[PDB]
């Protein structure tokens, strides 16, 4: 009947555990639509995906489609205010973002479930009448430039664009996708281009309804959402744009049998092997490329990685199909190299072709296909409920590739066993079709080429024909065997009934000297999974730099030894996480609860009886040295956060201190360390999920008994369980710590206004003030003043203390950012005074909606509890309590808080600043609002002297 709708789809196949309701349809103008109705959801969400992207950029205006993405947020005919969209979401508990790929531009948001329609209306105008204001165009070009700048010294981005640069230059694959100030302004200016014209030209040409997919999720009925979407999106005009296709591969014959030697910024050794392949997307029900990726990339007994590890040549390997665009794809194998491996790349590649040859020898394996199929089937059935914003964005993209009825299952369920396709793809993994890239600092000075956009330095050689032949003649290596049946595949999915004494929050069910056990049986999600979290306390994990190094290497070596065994468990939905902390060790086991005790028992047994392979020890130690050194290449703003974390924590070892001590770590000393670390411990655990109190008590005691049997562990004394405190800053003080980033030509800054110990009152004063200023700070500091791509504000919480923080990465010097942030804070004092009383309550309700947002998957609820436990506050009802108090706050209360704690002349202002200067700054001391004059800062010359010159805060009292 309805003329606005071209069709309604049939039942949209979903998991029987999914309680959400789905309708799919195609609009008259061709928009493909999925509607998701979830009456429980706290946040509603919508996303739109356009099947156009950087591959469609005009060759003379690189990055135009990425630039157009940024511009749609900045105003439309119906809603002209540059920030009406941001502001509307902020005051209704929303967020938004977008990304541009070669073939897609994806826009998405979430918001309070009551304001879906208000958000969606503003959002629809992006695709109807965008302004492309000239003042916004001039300002936003800078945001794009600093984003590129951030990427210039990043080894991944350099490799990403280097690949495009070494293929057919006539192919759109070569296009620079990001854009920068040169491609978007300075160069188009000297060629007479009116960019606002090209934006409107491009938007009008390609933003056509026939290339769009929309997904909307909210509490409304499926019928109500249907009316809503036709109301807002039928207006979008249909220009029947043909969908771009790229049938000719970017890598032709002249681009094969090629070797590239590349100089990295970080000290890394990597080998990249690539084969051009046809587009396998159409074969999604068969998934031939993923079958091969599963086998080549396997890490278990008999695998290619296993032999390469034993020879001491590589440490990690990943492989499989890599997307390109419609009409072309890649198959890749990525290994990191040891020092020895760098000298044996030829042999390493031979082993690769030997393993591939084994797969040809044995032919396709239906049992392998069956196993992959069964695992994906289990995965889909018990998939965790997704956060709405990410869910709509994902679905919006794949609406372009699968029938409406299959969108939810297309990427999970497998139907066809197709050995013809497996051999077809397998026939393409041959030496005559290969491309090899080596990344090592050993090529420094030996390169003869330079990549235009990032400056990557590299050398290109043809692979010698005799070397190709050795690879082509790869025999069978008897150390390569297909994997055996995966015995970690779960079979028991029974959901145990809720016990009578079950509780809404974690209960303390064991409180001994050795262990504190918090337990909760799942009463929400009812999936056959569980989370097992353990914190191991030992003073010897962080006593000095040397011991910290050894705690790290111990767990790295242990994970290395378990890798072959645990890989099967990971494929089977059973994964673990094990790393050292400043307080000891952290262990998490997540996944299907069926075979979970088996993996946990194997981990603890291995810890307590660990034998170190000397060859593995030397290799991992070398990698760890490089990892420490490679911090020099992180981004300025991350340095600033690192430095501030060192300044404000009672105890903290620097990367330099760790580097020095790493040389004094001998194999004998490590062998002695491990038994000393395990000799005395305290264990605090959260066991949460599809398990009962008896099972949980048994799991916790199994861990203890294993440690007692093999490591003779005894309890710690309670006075030994000590937490670190935060430095207490003086009233009206201001300290600055200054450092230089020697890799990146940007500067970074973090500003911390310390308030007081966490407290129900002090917590919500800060959080509410943070909410009020969140959007304005971004609008003022980024979109208006265009200081940098990275502009952040919000609460900082550490060691029981809290405060307000600003983080900026910019080309301008830090002392300038200091004033602009100081100028902004006064704007916020007036803005709070002038704002209406309902505008204020609007923020209160926005913060409330955020805090009370219910977790949708077990892992998220577990995280909430775990944060209460590791912080030793144990405030499991915090959300209800704090929101209740928040609602009673008044505009008067926030002004007093600002006047007392944050204002420039506040009697209790505690300000500490970290300035990370850019690579090229030697030193460092209109239309914009006026900044207050600031005092003379006390320049921190030594972090140790700084800390001992000041008091230390107390620790928070447990609930
Ligand atoms: C000159 C030349 C020749 C041959 C190849 C490359 C190359 C191409 C591309 C790269 C990119 C680089 C960023 O551009 N990325 C870094 C981290 C590893 C991430 N991935 S990946 O890990 O290989 C991968 C990606 C997608 C799907 C599956 C996989 C899989 F795991 F299955 F293999 C690619 C790698 C590097 C060199 C280059 C640059």
Contact 65, 100 (CB under 8 A): yes
User: What is the 3-state composition of the chain as percent helix, strand, coil, each rounded to the nearest 5?
Assistant: 45, 20, 35
CA nearest to 436, candidates 253, 254, 255, 259: 259
Structure-block tokens of residue 574 = 């059973």
Q: Is 826 helix (H, G, I), strand (E, B) or coil?
A: helix
Other Cβ atoms within 10 Å of 61 Cβ, number:
20
Structure-block tokens of residue 247 = 């049938």
Give CA–CA dist 527/318, Å, rounded: 30
Contact 109, 119 (CB under 8 A): yes
**Homologous superfamily of 500-726 in CATH?**
Metalloenzyme, LuxS/M16 peptidase-like (3.30.830.10)
> What's the 284 CA to ligand 1 centre distance in angstroms?
22
Give CA–CA dist 304/317, Å, rounded: 9
Which residues are CB-contacts of 199 (< 8 A; sequence separation ≥ 6)? 64, 67, 68, 71, 132, 137
Label residues 256-287 b or e (16+ Cβ within 10 Å = b).
Answer: bbbbbbbbbbbebbbbbbbbbbbbbeebbebb
Helix (H) or strand (E) holding 636, with range, is helix 636-648
Contact 214, 233 (CB under 8 A): yes
Does 272 sit in the ligand 1 pocket, CB within 6 Å?
yes
Does 154 sit in the ligand 1 pocket, CB within 6 Å?
no
- DSSP per-residue codes, 129-159: -B---HHHHHHHHHHHHHHHHHHHT-HHHHH
Give the phi and the psi of residue 348 in degrees, each rounded to 5.
-60, -45
> What's the 55 CA to ligand 1 centre distance in angstroms?
19
Give CA–CA dist 266/740, Å, rounded: 17
Distances, alpha carbon 861 to alpha carbons 185, 388, 508, in Å: 47, 16, 17
Does 456 sit in the ligand 1 pocket, CB within 6 Å?
no
Give CA–CA dist 466/350, Å, rounded: 13
Helix (H) or strand (E) holding 740, with range, is strand 733-740
Burial label, 857 (beta-carbon count in 10 A; 0-12, 13-18, 19+) = middle
Which residues are CB-contacts of 801 (< 8 A; sequence separation ≥ 6)? 726, 754, 756, 757, 758, 953
Beta partners for residue 274, in sequence order: 332, 435
CA nearest to 166, candidates 158, 154, 177, 156: 158
> What's the 331 CA to ligand 1 centre distance in angstroms?
9
Candidate CATH numbers 3.30.200.20, 3.30.830.10, 3.40.50.450, 3.40.50.1370; the one for domain 244-473: 3.30.830.10
Residue identifier of the C-alpha nearest atom 26 of ligand 1: 322
> What's the 832 CA to ligand 1 centre distance in angstroms?
49
Helix (H) or strand (E) holding 672, with range, is helix 667-679
Structure-block tokens of residue 262 = 């590349």
Structure-block tokens of residue 670 = 């490590």
Give the phi and the psi of residue 513 in degrees, each rounded to 5.
-65, -35
Burial label, 338 (beta-carbon count in 10 A; 0-12, 13-18, 19+) = buried
> What's the 158 CA to ligand 1 centre distance in angstroms?
11
Does 778 sit in the ligand 1 pocket, CB within 6 Å?
no
Does 160 sit in the ligand 1 pocket, CB within 6 Å?
yes
Q: What is the dihedral of CA 836, 840, 845, 848, to 10 degrees?
A: 180
Structure-block tokens of residue 390 = 């990410």
C-alpha atoms less than 13 angstroms from C-alpha of 185 in its C-beta half-sphere: 15
Does 902 sit in the ligand 1 pocket, CB within 6 Å?
no
Task: Please report where in the chains the tokens 């599809």 appear, as a residue.
Answer: 690
First to last CA, the chain: 62
Contact 250, 454 (CB under 8 A): no
Does 289 sit in the ligand 1 pocket, CB within 6 Å?
no
Contact 390, 324 (CB under 8 A): no
What is the number of the ligand 1 atom nearest to the C-alpha of 458? 1
Q: Is 201 helix (H, G, I), strand (E, B) or coil?
A: helix
Structure-block tokens of residue 857 = 């998957």
Contact 96, 77 (CB under 8 A): no
Does 261 sit in the ligand 1 pocket, CB within 6 Å?
no
Give CA–CA dist 215/228, Å, rounded: 12
Q: Is 299 helix (H, G, I), strand (E, B) or coil?
A: coil
Q: CATH number of the domain at 1-243, please? A: 3.30.830.10
What is the number of the ligand 1 atom nearest to the C-alpha of 160? 14
**Homologous superfamily of 727-959 in CATH?**
Metalloenzyme, LuxS/M16 peptidase-like (3.30.830.10)
Structure-block tokens of residue 71 = 């511009």
Does 260 sit in the ligand 1 pocket, CB within 6 Å?
yes
Does 259 sit in the ligand 1 pocket, CB within 6 Å?
no
Q: Is 34 helix (H, G, I), strand (E, B) or coil?
A: strand
CA nearest to 272, candidates 360, 159, 353: 159
**How is the beta sheet containing 328-336 ordered, strand by strand?**
317-325, 328-336, 270-277, 435-439, 258-262, 457-462, 449-450
Q: Is 238 helix (H, G, I), strand (E, B) or coil?
A: coil
Other Cβ atoms within 10 Å of 379 Cβ, number:
15
DSSP state of 924: -
Beta partners for residue 270, in sequence order: 336, 439
Beta partners for residue 64, in sequence order: none
Pocket test for ligand 1, best of 334, 440, 453, 463 (most atoms within 8 A of CB): 334
Number of helices (H), then strands (E), in the chain: 31, 27
What kind of experiment solved this structure?
Answer: X-ray
What is the number of the ligand 1 atom nearest to the C-alpha of 262? 1
Task: Please report where in the chains the tokens 């890649």 appear, as a residue.
Answer: 330
CA nearest to 545, candidates 672, 622, 653: 653
C-alpha atoms less than 13 angstroms from C-alpha of 122 in its C-beta half-sphere: 24
Give the phi and the psi of residue 622 in degrees, each rounded to 5.
-65, -40
Q: What is the dihedral of CA 152, 153, 154, 157, to 10 degrees?
A: 30
Residues of the chain with CATH 3.30.830.10: 1-243, 244-473, 500-726, 727-959
> What's the 651 CA to ligand 1 centre distance in angstroms?
39
CA nearest to 589, candidates 687, 695, 702: 687
DSSP state of 855: P
Structure-block tokens of residue 862 = 């577990």
Q: Is 48 helix (H, G, I), strand (E, B) or coil?
A: strand
Beta partners for residue 108, in sequence order: 47, 97
Give CA–CA dist 262/264, Å, rounded: 6
CA nearest to 124, candidates 47, 225, 222, 202: 47
Give CA–CA dist 628/545, Å, rounded: 13
Contact 15, 383 (CB under 8 A): yes
Give CA–CA dist 844/419, Å, rounded: 60
Give CA–CA dist 878/36, Å, rounded: 31
Label residues 204-234 b or e (16+ Cβ within 10 Å = b).
Answer: eebbbbbbbbbbbbbbbeeeebbebbbebbe
Which residues are CB-contacts of 755 (< 8 A; sequence separation ≥ 6)? 762, 765, 766, 802, 803, 804, 901, 910
Structure-block tokens of residue 577 = 């996480």
Does 276 sit in the ligand 1 pocket, CB within 6 Å?
no
Label residues 5-35 b or e (16+ Cβ within 10 Å = b).
Answer: beeebeebebbeeeebebbbbbbebbbbbbb
- DSSP per-residue codes, 9-55: -S-----TT---EEEEEEETT--EEEEEE-TT-SEEEEEEEES--GG
- DSSP per-residue codes, 243-255: PP---S-SS-GGG
What is the number of the ligand 1 atom nearest to the C-alpha of 322? 27
Report the DSSP pairing between strands 747-757 and 801-810.
antiparallel
- Total residue length of the chain: 959
Contact 611, 557 (CB under 8 A): no
Give CA–CA dist 858/690, Å, rounded: 10
Structure-block tokens of residue 431 = 């030496």
Give CA–CA dist 46/24, Å, rounded: 14
Does 166 sit in the ligand 1 pocket, CB within 6 Å?
yes
Helix (H) or strand (E) holding 793, with range, is strand 790-798
Contact 947, 650 (CB under 8 A): yes
Helix (H) or strand (E) holding 109, with range, is strand 105-112
Give CA–CA dist 417/676, Å, rounded: 54
Give CA–CA dist 305/820, Å, rounded: 53
What is the number of the ligand 1 atom nearest to the C-alpha of 297? 32
DSSP state of 209: G
> What's the 399 CA to ligand 1 centre distance in angstroms?
26
Task: Please report where in the chains the tokens 């030894």 appear, as a residue.
Answer: 561
Angle at the Cα of 765 from the Cα atoms of 761 and 769, rounded to 5 degrees: 170
Angle at the Cα of 527 from the Cα atoms of 525 and 532, rounded to 5 degrees: 90
DSSP state of 525: -
Does 182 sit in the ligand 1 pocket, CB within 6 Å?
no
Q: Is 915 helix (H, G, I), strand (E, B) or coil?
A: strand
Label residues 901-933 b or e (16+ Cβ within 10 Å = b).
Answer: bbbbebeebbbbbbbbbbeeeeeeeeeeeebee
Residue identifier of the C-alpha nearest atom 24 of ligand 1: 322
Contact 35, 18 (CB under 8 A): no
Structure-block tokens of residue 148 = 């590129």
Give CA–CA dist 489/496, Å, rounded: 19
Computed over its alpha carbons, how large is the radius of gyration of the chain?
29
Give CA–CA dist 380/400, Å, rounded: 20
């Amino acid at each position: 009947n309805n003329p606005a709708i071209k069709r309604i789809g049939n039942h949209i196949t979903k998991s029987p555990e999914d309680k959400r309701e789905y309708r799919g349809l195609e609009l008259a103008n061709g928009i493909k639509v999925l509607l998701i109705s979830d009456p429980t959801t706290d946040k509603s969400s919508a996303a739109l995906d356009v099947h156009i992207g950087s591959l469609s950029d005009p060759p003379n205006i690189a990055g135009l489609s990425h630039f157009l993405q940024h511009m749609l947020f900045l105003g439309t005919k119906k809603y002209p205010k540059e920030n009406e969209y941001s502001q509307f979401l902020s005051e209704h508990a929303g967020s938004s973002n977008a990304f541009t790929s070669g073939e897609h531009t994806n826009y998405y948001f979430d918001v309070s479930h009551e304001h879906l329609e208000g958000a969606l209306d503003r959002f629809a105008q992006f695709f109807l009448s965008p302004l492309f204001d000239e003042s916004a165009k001039d300002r936003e070009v800078n945001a794009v430039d600093s984003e590129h700048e951030k990427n210039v010294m990043n080894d991944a981005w350099r490799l990403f664009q280097l690949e495009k640069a070494t293929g057919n230059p006539k192919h759109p694959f070569s296009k620079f996708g990001t854009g920068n100030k040169y491609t978007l302004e300075t160069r188009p200016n000297q060629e007479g281009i009116d960019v606002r014209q090209e934006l409107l030209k491009f938007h009008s040409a390609y933003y056509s309804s026939n290339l769009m997919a929309v997904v909307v999720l909210g509490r409304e009925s499926l019928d109500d959402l249907t009316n809503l979407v036709v109301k807002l999106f039928s207006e979008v005009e249909n220009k029947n744009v043909p969908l771009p296709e790229f049938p000719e591969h970017p890598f032709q014959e002249e681009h094969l049998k090629q070797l590239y030697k590349i100089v990295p910024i970080k000290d890394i050794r990597n080998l990249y092997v690539t084969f051009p392949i046809p587009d396998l997307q159409k074969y999604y029900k068969s998934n031939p490329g993923h079958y091969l990726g599963h086998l080549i990339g396997h890490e278990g007994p008999g695998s290619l990685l296993s032999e390469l590890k034993s020879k001491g040549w590589v440490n990690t390997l990943v492989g499989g199909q890599k997307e390109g665009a419609r009409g072309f794809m890649f198959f890749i194998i990525n290994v990191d190299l040891t020092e020895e491996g760098l000298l044996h790349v030829e042999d390493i590649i031979l082993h690769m072709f030997q393993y591939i040859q084994k797969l040809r020898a044995e032919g396709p394996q239906e049992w392998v296909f069956q196993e992959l199929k069964d695992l994906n089937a289990v995965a889909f059935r018990f998939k965790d409920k997704e956060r709405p914003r990410g869910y709509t964005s994902k679905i919006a993209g794949i609406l372009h590739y699968y029938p409406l009825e299959e969108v939810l299952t297309a990427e999970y369920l497998l139907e066809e066993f197709r050995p013809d396709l497996i051999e077809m793809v397998l026939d393409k993994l041959r030496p005559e079709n290969v491309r090899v890239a080596i990344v090592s600092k050993s090529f420094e000075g030996k390169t003869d080429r330079t990549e235009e956009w990032y400056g990557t330095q590299y050398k290109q050689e043809a692979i010698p024909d005799e070397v190709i032949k050795k690879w082509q003649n790869a025999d069978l290596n008897g150390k390569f065997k297909l994997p055996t049946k995966n015995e970690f595949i779960p079979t028991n999915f029974e959901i145990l009934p809720l016990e009578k004494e079950a509780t809404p929050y974690p209960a303390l069910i064991k409180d001994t000297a050795m262990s504190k056990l918090w337990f909760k049986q799942d009463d929400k999600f009812f999936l056959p999974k569980a989370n097992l979290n353990f914190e191991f306390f030992s003073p010897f994990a962080y006593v000095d730099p040397l011991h910290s190094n050894m705690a790290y290497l111990y767990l790295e070596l242990l994970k290395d030894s378990l890798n072959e065994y645990a890989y099967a468990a990971e494929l089977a939905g059973l994964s673990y996480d094990l790393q050292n902390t400043i307080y000891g060790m952290y262990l998490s086991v997540k996944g299907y609860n069926d075979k979970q005790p088996i993996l946990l028992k194997k981990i603890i047994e291995k810890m307590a009886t660990f034998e170190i392979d000397e060859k593995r020890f030397e290799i991992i130690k070398e990698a760890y040295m490089r990892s420490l050194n490679n911090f020099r290449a992180e981004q300025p703003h991350q340095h600033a956060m690192y430095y501030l974390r060192l300044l404000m924590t009672e105890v903290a070892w620097t990367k330099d201190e760790l580097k020095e001590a790493l040389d004094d770590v001998t194999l004998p000393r490590l062998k002695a360390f491990i038994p000393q670390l395990l000799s005395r411990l305290h264990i605090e655990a959260l066991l949460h999920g599809n398990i009962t109190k008896q099972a949980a008590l048994g799991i916790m005691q199994m861990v203890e008994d294993t440690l007692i049997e093999h490591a003779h562990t005894k309890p710690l004394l309670p006075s030994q369980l000590v937490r670190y405190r935060e430095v207490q800053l003086p009233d009206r003080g201001w300290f600055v710590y200054q450092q230089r980033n020697e890799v990146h030509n940007n500067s970074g800054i973090e500003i911390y206004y310390q308030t007081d110990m966490q407290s129900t009152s002090e917590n919500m004063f800060l959080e509410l003030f943070a909410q009020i200023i969140s959007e304005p700070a971004f609008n003022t500091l980024r979109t208006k003043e265009q200081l940098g791509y990275i502009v952040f504000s919000g609460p900082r919480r550490a060691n029981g203390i809290q405060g307000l923080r600003f983080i900026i990465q910019s080309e301008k010097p830090p002392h300038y950012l200091e004033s602009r942030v100081e100028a902004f804070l006064i704007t916020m004092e007036k803005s709070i005074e002038d704002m209406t009383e309902e505008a204020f309550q609007k923020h209160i309700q926005a913060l409330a909606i955020r805090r009370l947002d219910k977790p949708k998957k077990l892992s998220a609820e577990s995280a909430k509890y775990w944060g209460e436990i590791i912080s030793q506050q144990y405030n499991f009802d915090r959300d209800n309590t704090e929101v209740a108090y928040l609602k009673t706050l008044t505009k008067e209360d926030i002004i007093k808080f600002y006047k007392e704690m944050l204002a420039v002349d506040a009697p209790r202002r505690h300000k500490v600043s970290v300035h990370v200067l850019a690579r090229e700054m030697d030193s460092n001391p209109i239309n914009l609002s006026q900044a207050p004059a600031l005092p003379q800062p006390e320049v921190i010359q030594n972090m140790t002297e700084f800390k001992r010159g000041l008091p230390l805060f107390p620790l928070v009292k447990p609930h």
